[PDB]
Amino acid sequence: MNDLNVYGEKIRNMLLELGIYNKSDDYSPDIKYNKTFHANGYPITGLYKFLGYYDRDNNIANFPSISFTTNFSSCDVTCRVLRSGNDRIIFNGKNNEKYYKRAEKALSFLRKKYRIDAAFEFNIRINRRYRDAKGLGESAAVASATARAVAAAVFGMDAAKDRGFVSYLARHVSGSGTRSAAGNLSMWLSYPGIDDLSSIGFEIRKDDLFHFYAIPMRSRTLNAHDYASSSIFYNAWVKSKFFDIIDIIENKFNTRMMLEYSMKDMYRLQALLISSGYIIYEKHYLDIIRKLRSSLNNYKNVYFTSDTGTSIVVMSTSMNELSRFVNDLDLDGISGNFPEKIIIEEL
Amino acid sequence: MNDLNVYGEKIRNMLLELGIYNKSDDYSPDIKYNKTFHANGYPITGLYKFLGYYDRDNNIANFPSISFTTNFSSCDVTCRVLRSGNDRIIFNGKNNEKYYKRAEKALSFLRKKYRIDAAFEFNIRINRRYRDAKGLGESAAVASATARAVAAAVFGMDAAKDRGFVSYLARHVSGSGTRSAAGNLSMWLSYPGIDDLSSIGFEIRDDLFHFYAIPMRSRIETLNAHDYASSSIFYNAWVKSKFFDIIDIIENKFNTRMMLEYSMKDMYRLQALLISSGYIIYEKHYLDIIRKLRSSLNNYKNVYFTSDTGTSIVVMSTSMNELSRFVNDLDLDGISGNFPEKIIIEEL
Ligand SMILES: CCCCCCCC/C=C\CCCCCCCC(=O)O
C-alpha cells in the first residue's frame, strides 16, 4: 500500500532525526568452521502489538511494533558450522521435523543471500519458569539467541555485537526476534515497501522503566497471523497502528502511555481474532480478566495485557502498588525482570 | 462526498428494479376517537445484523439490515386516542418514566408531522418465554405492535394493513421494528441521507428455515451496545463491509443458506466490535455452550447458529429433523422457535 508506505517512511524519518534508529550495516561471511559458539536470548511481551506479515517470506510486518524483554524463560543456543554434512536442529534434547522445518527457512535465506555452502548444528535450550503457557513470547528468545550464535559463527564477533545486524538476522527466524535482539525496551520498524536492512529492531532506552508480573495460562500463534490478516477489521487496525506509533514517538515513549496503550491493544488484538472465528477466551481466563478489570479502579498505574494466548502480564510504575495488587487479588504467577546480561561467546 | 449514501442509493435502485421494495405511501390522519384498537407484534433475530444509528432522532441506521421474526416473546398492545386528556403509557402493568420517554419520542414525531392534537392511552403487554435473557429482539415486538395499533386508530384499517406504512411508523419506536412490522423474513433499507418514507422494512418472502433459542444471561444492555459498537475503531470498517455484503446478498437473491452462514460470521464481527471497545460479552456458561456448538457443526449439514447483543444463541437449520437431532445430541436446554402465524389488528 502507498499510503501505508508514506506513513512508514514518515515514522522512519522521525526515528532517524531522534538518533535512536539507523539502517543496519551488512557483513561479509568469514566462517569459523568446527568451533562451537554460544549465545542467550530472552522472550518478549508486546506493548504496541504485532500480528500479520506484509511479506511472510522475509518476515516484514505491515506496521511497526514495540515490546519489552522479560525473564519469564531464557534461551541458550549452541551453534557449530561444518564444511559438509547435514543440518541438525536439537530443541530441548528433541530432534523433531517441526523444529527442523522452522530453522531450515531462516538458514535458506542465509545460504541464498550470502552464498554459503555449509551445514549447521544447533542445540537450543529453553528453560521456562512455568509448566505450560502460551503468549509469553518464547519464539523471540529462540530467534535472538540463534541469531547471535549464527552471527558470531558466520560473520564474527564484531557482527554479533552489532545489535542492528543481529536483529536483522533474528527477524528471519521470527519477527518478534527483532525486538528481543535489540534490547530491553525496543521497537521494530516495519511497513510495506521498507528495505530489507531497514526493517530491524532498536532499543528505546535502558532507564525509567516499570515493574511487571506474569500469570502463565494454558490456551488452545503462527495461525494468529493468518486469522488476524483475514479479519475484515485488519486494514482498520493497520491504519490506526501508524497513527498510534507516530503519537508515541511524539510523546517520547512515555511509560504510562505505553502501559495504557498495551491494555487497549490487548482488546483490539482479541477482537481481530474473534472476528475471524478464533475464540482466544477460556473459562479460567474469563474469571481472571473479570477479577483484574473489576479491581483496576482501586489501584494507581496498574495495567495488564495479553498477547496471542491466555497468559496475562500485569505492569506498574510502582513496585509496592504491583505487589499490593498481586497479593490482594491472590494472583498465582511469577515476578518479572528485564534481563541484564547478553552472552555471546566462542566455546 | 458521502460514500455510504452512494452505496445506499445503489442498493435502493437495485431493490426498485427487483420490484420487492417501494418508497412507503403516506396517509392523512382520520382519527377514530374513543375506540380501543388492539394489535400484536413479534421479536426479531438478526441475520445481517444492525448496530448504531446515523440519526438517532428519526431512527435512521448507518446501513441496511435483514432479520427474521420469531415467537420467543409476544407483544399485545391496546391503543385509544382521545380528543383531550393526558398520555398514558402502561408497560406490563407499570407506569414508569423510562417507558413514557421512549413512547413520547415516537408520539412527538406523530404529533409534529401529522398535526395531531390528541391524547394517547397505550397498554403494552410483553410475555417472554424466558427470564433475564438478553439479545432476543424484544423491542422490535413492541415497535411493530404499537405501530399497528396507532396506524389503525389514527389512519384507519387500510393504513394498518399497509406493511410499508406500518414499518415506517414502527421505525420511530425502534429501528428493528421496521423488520418485525414487514413480515417473517425482512429487510430494512437504511443509510445516511435516505428519505424518511424510503427507510422502511419489506418482506423478502416461501423457502424458509427452523430455529431454536438458548436464552442466556448477559451484562450489556442492547440500547448501550449501539454506543459501544459505534465508538469502536473497527465500526467504520464494519459499516463499509455491510454495504458490499448487502449488494452481494441481493445479487444472490437472498439465498437461505448464504444468509444463515452470513449470520454466523456476523455474530463474530459484532462480538469483536464490542470486545475492541473493552466490553466483554462472554460469560463462562456461554463459552461452554459455544465450544460445544462449534465442535459439533462439522457433523451436521445445514445447521448454523448466531447471537446478537447478548449471550442468547439462536440455532437454525433448513431441516426441522436435522435441527431436532442437533438439539437432542448436544442435550441443549432452550426453547423451540417458530415464525408467527397470526398478526392481529382489530377494533375492540
Ligand atoms: C408511532 C408509534 C408510537 C407508539 C410508542 C409507544 C411504544 C414505546 C413504549 C415502550 C418501549 C418499550 C421498550 C422495551 C422495554 C423493556 C424494559 C424492561 O423490560 O425492563
Numbering used by the authors:
A (entry chain B): 1 to 220, 223 to 349
B (entry chain A): 1 to 205, 207 to 349
Source paper text:
Mevalonate 3,5-bisphosphate decarboxylase is involved in the recently discovered Thermoplasma-type mevalonate pathway. The enzyme catalyzes the elimination of the 3-phosphate group from mevalonate 3,5-bisphosphate as well as concomitant decarboxylation of the substrate. This entire reaction of the enzyme resembles the latter half-reactions of its homologs, diphosphomevalonate decarboxylase and phosphomevalonate decarboxylase, which also catalyze ATP-dependent phosphorylation of the 3-hydroxyl group of their substrates. In this study, we determined the X-ray crystal structure of mevalonate 3,5-bisphosphate decarboxylase from Picrophilus torridus, a thermoacidophilic archaeon of the order Thermoplasmatales.
The X-ray crystal structure of PtoMBD was solved at 2.2 Å resolution. Two protein molecules are observed in the asymmetric unit of space group P21212. The PtoMBD monomers comprise 12 α-helices and 12 β-strands. The calculation of possible subunit interaction by the PISA program suggested that the most likely biological unit of PtoMBD is a homodimer made between subunit A and B of different asymmetric units of the crystal, not the two chains within an asymmetric unit. In the large cleft of subunit A, a continuous, linear tube of electron density of ∼20 Å length was observed, although with low occupancy. The internal surface of the cavity is mostly composed of hydrophobic amino acid residues, and the opening of the cavity is surrounded by charged or polar residues including Lys94, Tyr99, Arg128, and Glu138. Oleic acid (OLA) fitted well in the electron density and therefore was included in the structural model of PtoMBD.
